[PDB]
Nucleic acid binder design. Sequence first.
RNA 1: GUUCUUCCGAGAACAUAUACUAAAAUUGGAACAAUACAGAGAAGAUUAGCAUGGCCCCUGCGCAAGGAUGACACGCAAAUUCGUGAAGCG
RNA 2: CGCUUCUUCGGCUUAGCUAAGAUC
Lengths: 48, 257, 93, 49, 97, 126, 34, 312
Amino acid sequence: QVLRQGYNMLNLLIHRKNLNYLHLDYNFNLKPVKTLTTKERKKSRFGN
Amino acid sequence: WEDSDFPILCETCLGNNPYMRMMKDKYGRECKICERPFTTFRWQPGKGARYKNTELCQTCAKVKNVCQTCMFDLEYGLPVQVRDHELQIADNIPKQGANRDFFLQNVERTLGQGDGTQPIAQIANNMDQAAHDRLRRMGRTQPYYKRNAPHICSFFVKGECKRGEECPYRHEKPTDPDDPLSRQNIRDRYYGTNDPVAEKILNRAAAAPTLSPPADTTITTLYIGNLGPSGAQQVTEKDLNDFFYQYGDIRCLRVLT
Amino acid sequence: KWEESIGEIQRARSVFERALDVDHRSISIWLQYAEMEMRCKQINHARNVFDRAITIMPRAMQFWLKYSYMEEVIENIPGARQIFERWIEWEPP
Amino acid sequence: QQRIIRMVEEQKDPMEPPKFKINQKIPRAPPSPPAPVMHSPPRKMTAKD
Amino acid sequence: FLRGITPLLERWLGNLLSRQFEGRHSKGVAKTVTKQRVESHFDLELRAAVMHDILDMMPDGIKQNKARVILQHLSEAWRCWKANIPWKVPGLPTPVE
Amino acid sequence: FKPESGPVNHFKSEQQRSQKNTLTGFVEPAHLNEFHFNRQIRSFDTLGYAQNPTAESGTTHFVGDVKKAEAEKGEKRKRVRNDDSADIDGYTGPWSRFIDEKTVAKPTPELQKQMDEIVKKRQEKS
Amino acid sequence: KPKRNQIDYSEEIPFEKHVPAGFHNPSEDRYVVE
Amino acid sequence: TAQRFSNLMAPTMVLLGHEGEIYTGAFSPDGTCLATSGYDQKIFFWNVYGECENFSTIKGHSGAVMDLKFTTDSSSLVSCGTDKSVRVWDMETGTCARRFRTHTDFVNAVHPSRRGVTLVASASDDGTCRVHDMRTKEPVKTYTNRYQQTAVTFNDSSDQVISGGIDNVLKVWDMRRDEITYTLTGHRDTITGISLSPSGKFIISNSMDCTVRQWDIRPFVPGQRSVGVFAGHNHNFEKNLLKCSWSPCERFITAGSSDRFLYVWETLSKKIVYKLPGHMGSVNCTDFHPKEPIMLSCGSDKRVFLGEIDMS
RNA sequence: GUUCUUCCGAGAACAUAUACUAAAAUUGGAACAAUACAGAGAAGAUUAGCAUGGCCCCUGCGCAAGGAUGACACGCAAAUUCGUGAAGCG
RNA sequence: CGCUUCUUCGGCUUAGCUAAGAUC
Ligand SMILES: [Mg+2]
Ligand SMILES: [Mg+2]
Ligand SMILES: [Mg+2]
Ligand SMILES: [Mg+2]
Ligand SMILES: [Zn+2]
Ligand SMILES: [Zn+2]
Ligand SMILES: [Zn+2]
């Protein structure tokens, strides 16, 4: 559950920012699904 | 942000039961008219009612002297458009976001210098006593409680209310969607523009009969009637004397008992 | 001035009122705010503008001159006397 | 003549984030009305000054 | 590790969430003065102090626009010092100079 | 408590002359007994009358449907119970319906036809 | 093209500072618009 | 500057620390302190002077303390409650000297004998008056009335027990006869408190009919014993046992009120002399300081108010 | 619904007011991908970097730092007022 | 005694810093 919760909860934060070109896979690797524009790659730069 | 002990509400919103339970939620809603977060109050006005809650914040109630839920005027129980008409209060209140946010800030500063018991100046200090009478003689006197009943059950409109007699919502005819009373907006009802129920009031108030002097400018005579029969029920000539010399110099008074 | 030229006197008033919040010690703004009212024959507005100006900056002669002169040109000479009397109450130059 | 009402406080959910945006910015309230300037009379400048 | 990282992430994820829901209020937060920004900040506060001395020093009744010219004389007086040129402005008032 | 002498404003209504603290009345804190407060709510809600909440209530001892209060001073349906706890399919403990219980409500076809056009007129906006 | 990031200043008087009360009744002034 | 009437630290003092409805409050006869209690079951003691510090707090009741009285020498505090028990608290020790565990229902009121041997009259929801003597476990007298009794006092000679209750009539029981020698009839509704004048000539009796009636309890009275009627206070739907008390000079009378106001009447004229605001709920108990013109009032609002009054 | 009463089909005690009440129906508000065009601060060019301002944001855990110096700024700047003599007229 | 043309008199208001910021 804590993994389902945490996974869902990070996905919501991605979607809350409309970063729908990022994908959080189930082992929590954060993959860009497409080559990123300067706008997209700036906008999607999550922090620590 | 703004906070208070108790909501600005009219008695028909509170119900006839003088014992109430109410919930306070600080900053629990944004004000429908200005998006500012405000302390929200929620209550059920007697059994069979729905849970009502405050819709306006107190500054927006004070800046129109309106009930925070039903947004009728707190003095006469009339919509704003009716009251702003009779008092000649123009649509002065700003409506654009940054402009009216600035305005409301100054209202709150100004009222904060007062005693807290008054609306804004325009309506706190209006004195047209004839206009006050026109409003008094059209405001509803009894509290209308039917405006706190539950919403109509959409599943009953769909013909499929799967809760049956356990459904709290109303199982009855909607208002016909061609009637303009079905199509109301909180902003229209607050600022007092294009309000359907206001126009239905103003028209029927204007259609009421009235005195008007004749074209005979030489006539200065008034008939007076309903004086009752002769005897102890009849008004004396002194009675008319005392009531009517208030207004002007009677040349003659003729009594016909 | 531009709002006056478009006839938007009520807008023009608020703009001068907002100017005075920025610099209430600017004699130019009070005079230009006054002159535009009396250009528009808004004599009771203009009187209120001058009473504020002379109330706030009693040492600025330009308000007392322009105000008492306006009240004289408009032939309210006992009004003009009381302006000069109120001026002399400040023991002016 | 009077109502009497029990005011309970609605329970806040601790797991609920801040509800409303407050990045709004609006002009300052206008200053309190002008204090009269209260100067000593002007001292005349000569053109030499 | 988790003992100490728990409150750190609780704060950090709070700040992340709060700007994600409230928005970023940070307009008009005081920017502090740091390595590269010192030398421009010295020139701000110099010119502000100079300007305050100008306006207090001039007597009442002078067109204030003269003050912005005096700040030009300051910048020339510095360059002449920097470049060791002798600086002398012939008509400059001695309190201003 | 010595009354204010002299006339009273013709212009202000009695609502406007009234003693007040907020925009609409005199709010003040109170401490009732919690038990009796609850009793009075439920009497008004269920019976139509309650004892008057005002301080200095005077003669008006009862509020609401006072006719019942003076007359009375202050049947249920049956439920299809099946408390056989071993009856895996059949048991209905607290969830025993009334035998009357109209577990679904549908309008008559006359009301249906009226309400059918209402949703269509709403949908015809498109 | 629609615009909504700001008040339209021509719709209503922006940040309207109302003229203070004074001893002379301002409503005696009748102005005719140009 | 303004006139002052007492050694109080301020003309009005607000005493805070109770956790529930304060049903009862009394001054020590020596004037040094006052004791207060109620639904929170603790008994709080307060000095009348200086900071009015809550110098002691007795605990022990397993129920609300409905009534609370000092013995006349101030050496003991009598208290009674919904734990069916009367307790006598030793002042110097702070300890339960006696626990008259013999009532069978809530004890509504208590009054110690004024002089001679210490006797404790008590009235209860079991319908009985009982007089308990400190020296015996068994009560000296049990006077079974048919209906619940809410208030009790001795007469001044401590040989008649006066009680009232749901039947509205006050009984007067004569302790050598074990009979009701006479009854005082006139209240329209249940009595909530009875208090005996300093001289003992008169009693007042408060009732849910919102009147206080003054009765002449002297052995011989040449006619009607009803002396007069006071009005102004109100009893609300909480049906608290609103007490009543006498000024130590008898010129003034008080009663509890549900309308938040602290009422004082003048005994001779029956006019209200004070109707002080300041409580936020039922003023359940009111008393006068025995030596100095100070008023005690105890609210359902968990507040005790001490203040000066001009006892002219 | 349970522990007890009995004259027997009733009575005493215990138990005491859930729910932003919807399976809904309505109603605002942000960014998206790219055909051709002409293309990104400083008195010639290559042009740093750092500041300043408000009803301008974005990334960031952030009083750190980036986003073209993040973008903008880029001149009718009059804003308390005159004084002079010739020559036509009339 | 008044209007107009013209000149004529006082007034007639540079948007920081850094190693000229660096380089030819
Ligand atoms: Mg660069
Ligand atoms: Mg930067
Ligand atoms: Mg950069
Ligand atoms: Mg920048
Ligand atoms: Zn609002
Ligand atoms: Zn309302
Ligand atoms: Zn339904």
